[PDB]
């Protein structure tokens, strides 16, 4: 689809909300992420920040590619909220 960083605005930090202090972490692993980086995002500035920004920089790190990955561990409540809220 359009890239995930393709919203340059507070939508993204609305995210922050959504992809809360956990739930985040099993989708960056499953968005290709090494464990490592799963680490250094949670110290990182915030982790849906550096995130959002650094994911949203790789190939086709589509919104419904970041849905897709949420879809798979069923937390399809951040993605209908992603679809728009």
Same mark, same amino acid.
């Given at each position: 689809?359009?890239?995930?960083?393709?919203?340059?605005?507070?939508?993204?930090?609305?995210?922050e909300?959504?992809?809360?202090?956990?739930?985040? *972490?099993? !989708?960056?692993?499953?968005? $290709?992420? @090494?464990?490592?980086?799963?680490?250094?995002?949670?110290?990182? =500035?915030?982790?849906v *920040?550096? !995130?959002?920004?650094?994911? $949203?920089? @790789?190939?086709?790190?589509?919104?419904?590619?970041?849905?897709? =990955?949420?879809?798979?561990?069923?937390?399809?409540?951040?993605?209908?909220?992603?679809?728009?809220?």
């Open positions: 689809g359009n890239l995930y960083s393709s919203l340059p605005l507070t939508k993204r930090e609305e995210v909300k959504l992809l809360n202090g956990d739930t985040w *972490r099993h !989708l960056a692993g499953e968005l $290709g992420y @090494q464990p490592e980086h799963i680490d250094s995002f949670t110290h990182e =500035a915030c982790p *920040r550096a !995130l959002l920004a650094s994911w $949203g920089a @790789q190939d086709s790190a589509t919104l419904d590619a970041l849905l897709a =990955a949420l879809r798979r561990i069923q937390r399809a409540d951040i993605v209908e909220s992603l679809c728009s809220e």
